[PDB]
Amino acid sequence: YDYDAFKENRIIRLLKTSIDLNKTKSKIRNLCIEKAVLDKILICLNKVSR
Amino acid sequence: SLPKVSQSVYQMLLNEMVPLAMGIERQISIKRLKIEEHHTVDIIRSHNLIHELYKADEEEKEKVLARLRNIGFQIGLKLSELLIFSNNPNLKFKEMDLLLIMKFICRDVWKQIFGKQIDNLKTNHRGTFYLLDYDYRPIQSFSLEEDAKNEELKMIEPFLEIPVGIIRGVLSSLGYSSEEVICLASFIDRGVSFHVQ
Amino acid sequence: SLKAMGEEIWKNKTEKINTELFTLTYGSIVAQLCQDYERDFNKVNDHLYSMGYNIGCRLIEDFLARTALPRCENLVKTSEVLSKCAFKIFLNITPNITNWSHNKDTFSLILDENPLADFVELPMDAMKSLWYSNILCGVLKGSLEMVQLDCDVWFVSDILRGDSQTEIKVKLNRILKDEIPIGED
Amino acid sequence: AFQLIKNFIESISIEYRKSVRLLEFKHYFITSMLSYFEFENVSNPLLCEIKAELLMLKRDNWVQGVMATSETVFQENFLTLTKEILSLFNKCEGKRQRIVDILSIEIGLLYYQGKKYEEAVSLFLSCYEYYTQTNKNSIGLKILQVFIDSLSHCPKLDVLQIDGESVSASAVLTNAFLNILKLCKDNDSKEIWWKKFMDLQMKVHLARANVSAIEVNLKSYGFPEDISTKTMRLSLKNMGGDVIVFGASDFLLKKGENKLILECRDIMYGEFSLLSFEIIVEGITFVKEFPENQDEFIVVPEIYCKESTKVLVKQAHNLNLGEYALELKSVQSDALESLQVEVEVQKNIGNMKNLPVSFSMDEIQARKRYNTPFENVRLEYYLLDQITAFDLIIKTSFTKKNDQ
Amino acid sequence: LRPCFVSLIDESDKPILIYVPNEAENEMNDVLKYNVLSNISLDYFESALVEWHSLDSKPLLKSIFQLEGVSVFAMLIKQTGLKIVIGFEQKSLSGADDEFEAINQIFETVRKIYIRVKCNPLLVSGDEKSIIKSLERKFDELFI
């Protein structure tokens, strides 16, 4: 969401979802550490600022 | 006669496979917690689990209601052989008519689950037999708040999907798969309705 | 004392057949959890425990309604009433009490017959992954805390997997209190 | 009342304690023959002949038991006359159609006791399999075990004209059915001595059903510009084979046909292959459903159409681990639309072709949605043309020949 | 009194079990005998000379034929279509009626022990490996 990319924040995502993306990541051959880092990055960018 | 156990534990078992059905569908694996021997088990109880069906997405509710008739299907087609060993005379497997097995079920199954007959049976002669009982046993003890009677029938509507499965099971014991619906159909003095297909 | 009053409640109670029902019902709702999870067995114990909890918490008020009993405190009295007028009233059976601990705490609950695993044969893939009658640990853990105790129950062995008996090793860990009816002024 | 006479036939047989005297009770069966004339009131009817034939069958069984202490070949030449007469009597206008097949097999067991003559059981090879239809786990094993030595022994390969299959195809189907219905450990001599002939006679036009050897899947990985492609584990049923087995994953608009191989030496159970695949289609798309053919070509396409619509959704996505591919980008452009395509090049070189795909003809490199195919190209520029252009599709089929 | 084969046939004419209770004998020598007798005994259920009436709770026994010195006894229970056929050797029969009723309680044991594992509430519903290999370890318990 780029409306607050230049008002007191940057990299603040809009209202998408993550359970279907996690199901797609589980349905491939992704390892537990890579899914841990990717779920941590998407969890941080669920609501963030810069 | 037979060895016996008490009805009040069975009826209270029979009331609550619908919290078991939403705890098997919603939990694919405000909710609470408990512990055992270096473990934990996450618990959710029945008042906060039938009320997730008043706020149910429509494919989720219709996914649940297949499971209630699947439970009824398994207990019906397992029950019919032991009721055959009870007596079950004078009927056959292919069974060209239908009233002689509708005379069977109200006298022979519904006494062994609920202690009385299906006291009304209406005969559309092309094969739609209406089975009406007035005071159904497990729904003797359910009521909503102070005159909010409209919003409880649609709340309590999963609880009649056990005798969908019972009459599916005792007819798949005699051959085939059929089509079933339910009604409420209140009395005339001091209700429920089932079809056949 | 008790066993006279247990048969006295077995003369004014509503009854039905324990064969051809209720083993069917409990076996059907364990076959659903067998097929619903999709043939995994160490999870169905932790759903049958969480279902037996909710069915025990409401049973305890019916059992105190049928027979007028005080709040039990020691494990002489709970172990006497569970062997004499709880299982006798509800399920027509009675257990026996062995394997008693030191300091009057943790005992065993050997069941002679069992009208939940009655005439059931268990398949070979669950010899070491399933507890069959683990609604009983649900009703004991969710029923003994509602007389303001706090316990822990677990099966130790079963007739289906093992020649040794069906026994539940119930442990007293602590006794809960009654709470004072405000925080403060 | 004949049943009452059968009770009379149950009576003296209850009171039998001398087998030389009880043959005189077989003469009482002759008296039942004197009841067989005394039960007849007409020429022919369905229920009358059906009641008539059973006493003659019991008398035929008593006459068979009469020779228990052993007329040199007169019994083995003459009992088939009474047996065929009883089968013709019980073939009268009722559905008793397992008496006919069992009586024909009883005649065939005496035909095999002679020289290996003209066959009726193997001529009705559909009936020979139809005894094995209702999962007859024992009768049809012998009803095929006699017919296998009958077709092998006769050495004249012009088959019957129910369907003219005048080759080793019927005996190969018999060998496959007898190996399928056998025991596992004790059927090595049954396997090898009938698997050896189809090697030399490789008619080799067979489409089996794969009940002998089973299969199961696993996850899917990558390789050196190749797909590891669902490293399957198979079962075992026999000694060995040599098959170029390939599975067939198929999406909602294409078919991958991956998991191929060339050689196989499967002898042990839990076969646990790897099945490395080239020609990775659909950019390794995730919606590739399993048509699950697994056509293990052990000198015959012994396929298994393991189809459903279960939506288990074998995903098997791509990876980029320094292998040659091609991309698409349109940077450094002028003030009109274009496209570009750079390839992570390597030694071996072959062709590629790009095509537009929309409901209308959105892009147009030519007047129509052209190809612009090229051999050994690193980067270039392709233009476009006029439509309501926001976002079009593409497909860049690249026969790279870096693999085979 | 002790049988030489038992057999159970389902709603169709598909056999559920053709079981020999003296299992690995010196005179095994074929399983064709006690199999073609069952295949003809399914055909003797639409023979018009014998007939099973349809009024009573207790279905009835019959004495259908004898062959190879083996008597068969069969009972169509009318509700689950279950065609159950047994055989005995010829001179184990005494001709009396106490052994006839002992044969009837052999049926009332084996019908009971089949409908018990028809109601074993952990199996998947079908004629799998499990049902036959449970029926044999109960029939070895009944017949030594």
UniProtKB/Swiss-Prot annotation, chain B:
Keywords: Acetylation, Autophagy, Endoplasmic reticulum, ER-Golgi transport, Golgi apparatus, Transport. InterPro entries: NO_sig/Golgi_transp_ligand-bd, TRAPP_component, TRAPPC6/Trs33. Its main location: Golgi. It is found in: Golgi apparatus, cis-Golgi network; Endoplasmic reticulum; Preautophagosomal structure. The keyword Endoplasmic reticulum applies. Gene3D superfamilies: Trafficking protein particle complex subunit 3. Coiled coil: none annotated. One of its GO terms (cellular component) is TRAPPI protein complex. GO terms for biological process: endoplasmic reticulum to Golgi vesicle-mediated transport; intra-Golgi vesicle-mediated transport; macroautophagy; positive regulation of macroautophagy; protein localization to phagophore assembly site; protein-containing complex assembly; protein-containing complex localization; retrograde transport, endosome to Golgi. It holds the Pfam family TRAPP. Part of the multisubunit TRAPP (transport protein particle) I complex composed of BET3, BET5, TRS20, TRS23, TRS31 and TRS33. Part of the multisubunit TRAPP (transport protein particle) II complex composed of BET3, BET5, TRS20, TRS23, TRS31, TRS33, TRS65, TRS85, TRS120 and TRS130. Part of the multisubunit TRAPP (transport protein particle) III complex composed of BET3, BET5, TRS20, TRS23, TRS31, TRS33 and TRS85. Belongs to the TRAPP small subunits family. BET3 subfamily. This is Trafficking protein particle complex subunit 33. It comes from Saccharomyces cerevisiae (strain ATCC 204508 / S288c) (Baker's yeast). The gene is TRS33.
UniProtKB/Swiss-Prot annotation, chain C:
SUPFAM superfamilies: Ligand-binding domain in the NO signalling and Golgi transport. It is found in: Golgi apparatus, cis-Golgi network; Endoplasmic reticulum; Preautophagosomal structure. A lipid is attached at residue 72 (S-palmitoyl cysteine). Gene3D superfamilies: Trafficking protein particle complex subunit 3. Keywords: Autophagy, Endoplasmic reticulum, ER-Golgi transport, Golgi apparatus, Lipoprotein, Palmitate, Transport. InterPro entries: Bet3, NO_sig/Golgi_transp_ligand-bd, TRAPP_component. It comes from the Eukaryota. CDD domains: TRAPPC3_bet3. GO terms for biological process: cellular response to nitrogen starvation; cytoplasm to vacuole targeting by the Cvt pathway; endoplasmic reticulum to Golgi vesicle-mediated transport; intra-Golgi vesicle-mediated transport; macroautophagy; retrograde transport, endosome to Golgi. One of its GO terms (cellular component) is cytosol. Part of the multisubunit TRAPP (transport protein particle) I complex composed of BET3, BET5, TRS20, TRS23, TRS31 and TRS33. Part of the multisubunit TRAPP (transport protein particle) II complex composed of BET3, BET5, TRS20, TRS23, TRS31, TRS33, TRS65, TRS85, TRS120 and TRS130. Part of the multisubunit TRAPP (transport protein particle) III complex composed of BET3, BET5, TRS20, TRS23, TRS31, TRS33 and TRS85. Present with 2370 molecules/cell in log phase SD medium. Belongs to the TRAPP small subunits family. BET3 subfamily. This is Trafficking protein particle complex subunit BET3. The gene is BET3.
Swiss-Prot record, chain D:
This is Trafficking protein particle complex II-specific subunit 130. Part of the multisubunit TRAPP (transport protein particle) II complex composed of BET3, BET5, TRS20, TRS23, TRS31, TRS33, TRS65, TRS120 and TRS130. Interacts with YPT31 and YPT32. Present with 432 molecules/cell in log phase SD medium. It is found in: Golgi apparatus. Specific subunit of the TRAPP II complex, a highly conserved vesicle tethering complex that functions in the late Golgi as a guanine nucleotide exchange factor (GEF) for the Golgi YPT1 GTPase. TRS130 plays a role in the YPT GEF activity of TRAPP II in concert with the two other TRAPP II-specific subunits TRS65 and TRS120. Required for both the cytoplasm-to-vacuole targeting (Cvt) pathway and starvation-induced autophagy through its role in ATG8 and ATG9 trafficking. It comes from the Eukaryota. Disulfide bonds: none annotated. Transmembrane segments: none annotated. Belongs to the TMEM1 family.
From Swiss-Prot, chain E:
Its main location: Golgi. GO terms for biological process: early endosome to Golgi transport; endoplasmic reticulum to Golgi vesicle-mediated transport; intra-Golgi vesicle-mediated transport; protein-containing complex assembly; retrograde transport, endosome to Golgi. Keywords: Golgi apparatus. It holds the Pfam family Sedlin_N. It is found in: Golgi apparatus, trans-Golgi network. GO terms for cellular component: cytoplasm; cytosol; Golgi apparatus; nucleus; TRAPP complex; TRAPPII protein complex. Belongs to the TRAPP small subunits family. Sedlin subfamily. Required, together with the TRAPP II subunit TRS33, for TRAPP II complex assembly or stability, and for proper Golgi localization of TRAPP and the Rab GTPase YPT31. Present with 8660 molecules/cell in log phase SD medium. Interacts with the TRAPP II complex; TRAPP II subunits TRS33 and TRS65 are required for this interaction. This is TRAPP-associated protein TCA17.
